[PDB]
Amino acid sequence: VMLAFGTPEKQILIEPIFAQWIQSAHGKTSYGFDVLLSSTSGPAFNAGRSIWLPGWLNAINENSNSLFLTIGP
Amino acid sequence: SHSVKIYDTCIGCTQCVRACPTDVLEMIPWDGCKAKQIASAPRTEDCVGCKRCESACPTDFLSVRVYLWHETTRSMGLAY
Amino acid sequence: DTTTWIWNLHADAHDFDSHTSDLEEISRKVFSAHFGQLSIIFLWLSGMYFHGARFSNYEAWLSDPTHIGPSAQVVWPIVGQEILNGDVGGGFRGIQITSGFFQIWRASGITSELQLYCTAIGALVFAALMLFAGWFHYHKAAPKLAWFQDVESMLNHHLAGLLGLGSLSWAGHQVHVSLPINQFLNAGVDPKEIPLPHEFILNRDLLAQLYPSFAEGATPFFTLNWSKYSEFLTFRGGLDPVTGGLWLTDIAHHHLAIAILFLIAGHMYRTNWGIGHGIKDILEAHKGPFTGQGHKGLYEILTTSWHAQLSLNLAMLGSLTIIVAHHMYSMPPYPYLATDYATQLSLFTHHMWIGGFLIVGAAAHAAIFMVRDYDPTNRYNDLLDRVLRHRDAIISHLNWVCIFLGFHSFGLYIHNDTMSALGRPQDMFSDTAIQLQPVFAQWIQNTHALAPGVTAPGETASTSLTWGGGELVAVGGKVALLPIPLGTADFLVHHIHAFTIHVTVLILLKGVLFARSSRLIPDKANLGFRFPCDGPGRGGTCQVSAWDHVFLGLFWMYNAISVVIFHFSWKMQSDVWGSISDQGVVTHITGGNFAQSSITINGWLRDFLWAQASQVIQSYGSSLSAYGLFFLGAHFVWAFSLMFLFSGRGYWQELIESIVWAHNKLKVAPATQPRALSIIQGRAVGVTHYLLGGIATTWAFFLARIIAV
Amino acid sequence: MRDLKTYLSVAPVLSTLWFGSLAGLLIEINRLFPDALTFPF
Amino acid sequence: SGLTPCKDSKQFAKREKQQIKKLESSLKLYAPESAPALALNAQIEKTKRRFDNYGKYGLLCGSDGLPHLIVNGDQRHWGEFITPGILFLYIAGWIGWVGRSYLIAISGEKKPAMKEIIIDVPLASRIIFRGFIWPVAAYREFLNGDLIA
Numbered sequence A: 001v002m003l004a005f006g007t008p009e010k011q012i013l014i015e016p017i018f019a020q021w022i023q024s025a026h027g028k029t030s031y032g033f034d035v036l037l038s039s040t041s042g043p044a045f046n047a048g049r050s051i052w053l054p055g056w057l058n059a060i061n062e063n064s065n066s067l068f069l070t071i072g073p
Numbered sequence B: 001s002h003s004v005k006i007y008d009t010c011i012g013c014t015q016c017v018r019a020c021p022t023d024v025l026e027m028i029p030w031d032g033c034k035a036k037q038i039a040s041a042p043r044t045e046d047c048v049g050c051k052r053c054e055s056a057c058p059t060d061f062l063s064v065r066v067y068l069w070h071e072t073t074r075s076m077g078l079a080y
Numbered sequence C: 001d002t003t004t005w006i007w008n009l010h011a012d013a014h015d016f017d018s019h020t021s022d023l024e025e026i027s028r029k030v031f032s033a034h035f036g037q038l039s040i041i042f043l044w045l046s047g048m049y050f051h052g053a054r055f056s057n058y059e060a061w062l063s064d065p066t067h068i069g070p071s072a073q074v075v076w077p078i079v080g081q082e083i084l085n086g087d088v089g090g091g092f093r094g095i096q097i098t099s100g101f102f103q104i105w106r107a108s109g110i111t112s113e114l115q116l117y118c119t120a121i122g123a124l125v126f127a128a129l130m131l132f133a134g135w136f137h138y139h140k141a142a143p144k145l146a147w148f149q150d151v152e153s154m155l156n157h158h159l160a161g162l163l164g165l166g167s168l169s170w171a172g173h174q175v176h177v178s179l180p181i182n183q184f185l186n187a188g189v190d191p192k193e194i195p196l197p198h199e200f201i202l203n204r205d206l207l208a209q210l211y212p213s214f215a216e217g218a219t220p221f222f223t224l225n226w227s228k229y230s231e232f233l234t235f236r237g238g239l240d241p242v243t244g245g246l247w248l249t250d251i252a253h254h255h256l257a258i259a260i261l262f263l264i265a266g267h268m269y270r271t272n273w274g275i276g277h278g279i280k281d282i283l284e285a286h287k288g289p290f291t292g293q294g295h296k297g298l299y300e301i302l303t304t305s306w307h308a309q310l311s312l313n314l315a316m317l318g319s320l321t322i323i324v325a326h327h328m329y330s331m332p333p334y335p336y337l338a339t340d341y342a343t344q345l346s347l348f349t350h351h352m353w354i355g356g357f358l359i360v361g362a363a364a365h366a367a368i369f370m371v372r373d374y375d376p377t378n379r380y381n382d383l384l385d386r387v388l389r390h391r392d393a394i395i396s397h398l399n400w401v402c403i404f405l406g407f408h409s410f411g412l413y414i415h416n417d418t419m420s421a422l423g424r425p426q427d428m429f430s431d432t433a434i435q436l437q438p439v440f441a442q443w444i445q446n447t448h449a450l451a452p453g454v455t456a457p458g459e460t461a462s463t464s465l466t467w468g469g470g471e472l473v474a475v476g477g478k479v480a481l482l483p484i485p486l487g488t489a490d491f492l493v494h495h496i497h498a499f500t501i502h503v504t505v506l507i508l509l510k511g512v513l514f515a516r517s518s519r520l521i522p523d524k525a526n527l528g529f530r531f532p533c534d535g536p537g538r539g540g541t542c543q544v545s546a547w548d549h550v551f552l553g554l555f556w557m558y559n560a561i562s563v564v565i566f567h568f569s570w571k572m573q574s575d576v577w578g579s580i581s582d583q584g585v586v587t588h589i590t591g592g593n594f595a596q597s598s599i600t601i602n603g604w605l606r607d608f609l610w611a612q613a614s615q616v617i618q619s620y621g622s623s624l625s626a627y628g629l630f631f632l633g634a635h636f637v638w639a640f641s642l643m644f645l646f647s648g649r650g651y652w653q654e655l656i657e658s659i660v661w662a663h664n665k666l667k668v669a670p671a672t673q674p675r676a677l678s679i680i681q682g683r684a685v686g687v688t689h690y691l692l693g694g695i696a697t698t699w700a701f702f703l704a705r706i707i708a709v
Numbered sequence D: 001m002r003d004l005k006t007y008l009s010v011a012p013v014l015s016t017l018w019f020g021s022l023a024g025l026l027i028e029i030n031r032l033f034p035d036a037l038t039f040p041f
Numbered sequence E: 001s002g003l004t005p006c007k008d009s010k011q012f013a014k015r016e017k018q019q020i021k022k023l024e025s026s027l028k029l030y031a032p033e034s035a036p037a038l039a040l041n042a043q044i045e046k047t048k049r050r051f052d053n054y055g056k057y058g059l060l061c062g063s064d065g066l067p068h069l070i071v072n073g074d075q076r077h078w079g080e081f082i083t084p085g086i087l088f089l090y091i092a093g094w095i096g097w098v099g100r101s102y103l104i105a106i107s108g109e110k111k112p113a114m115k116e117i118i119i120d121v122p123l124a125s126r127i128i129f130r131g132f133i134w135p136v137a138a139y140r141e142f143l144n145g146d147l148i149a
């Protein structure tokens, strides 16, 4: 109804904060939460930085594939 | 044909016998209730399964029960 | 006690035969109910007349009919809904109406907003009068039964007085008001300078200037020198070039002739003075060559039963409404109606649905009469008995025709679709490969085109312009009417119509004939007209009553009517409607793609449904967004109907049991025990939502498409 | 009369009166505080 | 989360400008003093005030130019979801408590089903005021053990 009456700025749009937080904790830097693997000073990052972290971090931050796509309302 | 069973919660109000459209049920004497009678189902080979008998039983749960089974020409209501 | 009582209260509110068994009381209640309905109709007319006086651009439209869109509704600016106030022209903002009220007022001679106010006040007064009359005739002075059964006097008055005198009075109004005012309007005279209608009556030389025959007075009428009145009583035929409707003089002459004929016809049946026939005598004495004994016994049946009369009247009214819908698009009776496409599409679809509903009602009430009022002992009739004694032959033959028609009308479409898909366009049933020409219809068209001048010496032009041979008519740069070609595409769709009508007739007639009894349930009459089933015996006896036959026939009526309106819409958009340039080249809205695209099922899905629905789905943000909102809402109702149609009653009762337990846990258990809907009610709820959703979707689609283009 | 009060207390009429008053009230706030998405208090 | 405030949203400004331009297109069609023009002029001001108020409340807009709601519990966005939530809970509890209290009162009658159709208005008017203190009433009734049958 809000968009039918020509006023799109009245829509109830809610950001999926929890899934975005999970994605940030997995190493995605498209939101800026800086938690866990997205934080370079964390205990989690230092544990696996020299085993598998570089390739996974490179793959997840490439936005041309379907690995942890960006989400919205 | 179908199977019709009568249980001992009968009160002998004769409604099921009147509701049968094929003359399957009948009433017999029995000293287990005030009315001193109970229903019976001696001709179940003519039952068609319309369950008009169960719609007439007034007990908490039916004292007459019909279980559907092998179906024949008589129980299918076929005239051709 | 339980919740089914609330539902049963509204289900039997108007079933007077169940309340009482006395015919007198039923007749009195029927009379009062009719009075109440008349009052409601008068109130509706008063509202319609008032709204066009205060919240409409009628005058601006009257000064420029072609370029201004009619409007009679205005919205309050509360929640931002004032976006629906579009720019309809004439310095006015509002919702564009499609009921064709402006054309009626213009053809009646109305020029200002003062007359509409007076009409609204009069209609309100009449509504109050009707309500008081209903109260009086039920509570104070209720007639006797013998008054209602005088059907010889009812027919005389309803023919001579209601229909005979109404036409004469309307012809008088037309002659005295509508002809001169419309002549002044058609001459380019500004509407505010036209003399008031009473000036024509008071001043006679003003009328004599327009029509010299008015100078002679009423003497030529009495002297039988009727040729002098030919100035305003013509037999021209065809459409008016200025406005695009029929000549008003033709309408006046037609109404005069109709009034005289009805007045003559109203003096047939016998009354106290002993001249005229008696209906019973006509029915009894009639014995042709194959009837034998005759119609002896129908008078009592039709005078002692309300359901038989209701069924007959409903069938006749439905057929009449369908005829009215067909006869108004081809011979437009009002000025500036043919070239206004939004109203033309809306008037054809309304009356078709009304007629279909009334026909289904006729079938239902015939079934009700057969179940309830049938009496072979006291009201024996021979013809009904003979029809009931060979009902097996009637149904089995009607069953065969449906299969034959369905195969030979739908397999042609499927064959065309397959041949198109396989890359073999030379093997389809079309105008280029295999032709199935409707030769009889083309012969009829040629005969009707050539009828003037040979078989109709007094006619100057053909009755309508649809018969090929006439000339194109243009009003304000738009196309009003032109000959309609008939080809192979029109051969298939007519047989589709025939197939659907035959299937609906089969369902309804089977229900009516087998209402009393059948080979499966010999005692079906004792079970009633409206009962769900007779148990799971004999393999299953679901939906054996006549009510369920009407319930099934509603779906097929809806299916049949929908194809008719789609056919009309596409054929008119592709072959008639359009625009004409200054040099005389006609460009139709869809460019004549009906001939080649309407022979396969893919053509209707791609060229009609997909292509013509782009207007409604792009209406967001504009003044037509209400149609876009109603388009989506109707799908929800249609899909919501399927829950009741596909499911049963036990599951919902058990679910309600669990819910009631959860309510009992917190001492919020109502004393009125909740119950799921009955078997019959669940069916009635589903079909209502189904029809509502389908009709609303089609309504929004049509209205959003045709207003924009 | 007593019958007038008894008919006025029946469920449909009372529900219609309540819902009409409710709709009027809601329109009143929507007119007084239009286009509202967050609480500024 | 990558969101920018409304007051610094170029797409928000573009939306406002486009809506105003579309509204002003229909204003040129009528005389300036006419009633339709007067009604149209009141729409532009409403749009301007709505956009100003949306900017003034610190709402967050994305790359689309449309405000987003944050319901994770941040103290800077308690008016979006937390504040209206408690109000709805209070009102719904009021309604439920009134409905529950009416049924219990009439349960002891000889024909309690008759009071569910013809509502006892004098009895209902007294219970209505009692729903104001429903949180305290329910809290006390839960402890005493009378809440559940």
Ligand code: CLA
Residues within 6 Å of the ligand: A015, A016, A017, A018, A019, A020, E071, E081, E082, E083, E085, E086
């Ligand atoms: C029964 C209701 C219900 C169900 C089945 C779900 C299910 C889901 N939600 Mg969800 N949600 C709910 C209610 C519900 N939600 C409510 C009421 C809110 C608003 C507070 C949210 C806000 C929310 C967000 C912001 C997100 C989800 C997401 C998701 C998905 C991932 C799972 C997750 O994060 O769980 C979340 C589970 C909860 C938050 C628990 C809520 C369930 C309780 C019982 C509701 C009680 C409401 C309570 C009365 C309100 C108190 C507030 C008051 C004090 C002001 C999943 C499909 C995520 C997703 O993937 O989206 C794409 C995501 O990002 N939800």
Ligand code: CLA
Residues within 6 Å of the ligand: C028, C029, C030, C032, C033, C035, C036, C040, C131, C132, C134, C135, C138
């Ligand atoms: C104030 C005037 C008045 C009063 C006090 C009564 C009183 C009575 N009438 Mg009555 N009647 C009236 C006017 C009145 N009538 C008028 C004007 C008509 C002509 C239409 C009738 C026609 C009529 C009939 C045919 C019958 C009665 C009967 C009765 C008696 C029992 C029915 C009843 O009231 O149950 C309660 C009934 C109602 C409250 C009526 C509600 C029905 C709807 C609301 C009518 C409104 C029309 C429509 C639905 C509204 C607009 C359309 C749309 C919005 C839906 C009762 C003594 C019955 C009787 O005596 O049988 C023994 C009976 O059979 N009346």
Ligand code: CLA
Residues within 6 Å of the ligand: C107, C162, C163, C164, C166, C167, C170, C251, C258, C320, C323, C324, C327, C328, C333, C334
């Ligand atoms: C055969 C009868 C007949 C016909 C053809 C017409 C035709 C017409 N009338 Mg009309 N009228 C009639 C009888 C008829 N009237 C009677 C009896 C009355 C008095 C109640 C009126 C009162 C009346 C008024 C007050 C007005 C009209 C108007 C009109 C014109 C508008 C178009 C229209 O209504 O749709 C087409 C209409 C029909 C097809 C009529 C169907 C009704 C049927 C024919 C009833 C008669 C049954 C009869 C036995 C024939 C059987 C059906 C037939 C197909 C075999 C139209 C030319 C309007 C007008 O002049 O505007 C310019 C107008 O304002 N009429």
Ligand code: CLA
Residues within 6 Å of the ligand: C010, C011, C012, C013, C014, C015, C016, C357, C358, C359, C360, C361, C362, C364, C368, C529, C530, C547, C550, C688
């Ligand atoms: C002149 C026309 C006419 C008349 C006088 C009657 C009269 C009658 N019909 Mg009937 N009927 C008609 C036309 C007519 N019918 C048509 C055209 C059809 C075909 C659809 C039917 C189909 C039909 C059936 C199938 C049955 C009847 C029955 C009856 C009898 C009882 C009716 C009743 O209790 O309704 C009570 C009134 C209602 C239930 C109201 C219906 C409400 C509709 C369906 C919903 C409308 C939705 C609306 C658009 C949205 C409103 C929203 C709002 C609520 C907020 C009564 C004698 C019944 C009968 O005799 O059984 C023994 C019966 O079973 N009729």
Ligand code: CLA
Residues within 6 Å of the ligand: C658, C659, C660, C662, C663, C666, C668, E095, E096, E097, E098, E099, E100, E102, E119, E124
């Ligand atoms: C005031 C009465 C009342 C109360 C206290 C409850 C309470 C409850 N219902 Mg409930 N219900 C009611 C009326 C009521 N219902 C009515 C009238 C209906 C039929 C429409 C339902 C249909 C219903 C279903 C289908 C379900 C519940 C469920 C529930 C439980 C989950 C919480 C909830 O809100 O569910 C949500 C409740 C609703 C969405 C119901 C709609 C609210 C209605 C419209 C309020 C009516 C108030 C009424 C007019 C009181 C008048 C008071 C006046 C006399 C002063 C909860 C115990 C659920 C449950 O746990 O299983 C049992 C569940 O699945 N209810």
Ligand SMILES: CC1=C(C/C=C(\C)CCC[C@H](C)CCC[C@H](C)CCCC(C)C)C(=O)c2ccccc2C1=O
Residues within 6 Å of the ligand: C643, C644, C645, C647, C648, C649, C652, C675, C676, C677, C678, C679, C682, C683, D015
């Ligand atoms: C959904 C469904 C139901 C459930 C639907 C029910 C119980 C109908 C009743 C629903 C309404 C909404 C109940 C309204 C109750 C009160 C009027 C509510 C008052 C409170 C406020 C709204 C004022 C059936 O009972 C059923 C039966 C047979 C075939 C199919 C179905 C079926 O599909």
Ligand code: SF4
Residues within 6 Å of the ligand: B004, B019, B020, B021, B022, B023, B024, B025, B046, B047, B048, B049, B050, B051, B052, B053, B054, B066
């Ligand atoms: S099921 Fe029908 S036929 Fe069989 S005993 Fe019962 S009532 Fe008689």
Ligand code: SF4
Residues within 6 Å of the ligand: B009, B010, B011, B012, B013, B014, B015, B016, B017, B038, B039, B056, B057, B058, B059, B063, B064
């Ligand atoms: S079966 Fe039912 S109806 Fe028949 S006697 Fe027993 S209790 Fe009565």
Ligand code: SF4
Residues within 6 Å of the ligand: C532, C533, C534, C535, C536, C540, C541, C542, C543, C679
């Ligand atoms: S219970 Fe349902 S499915 Fe079974 S016979 Fe009755 S209506 Fe048919």
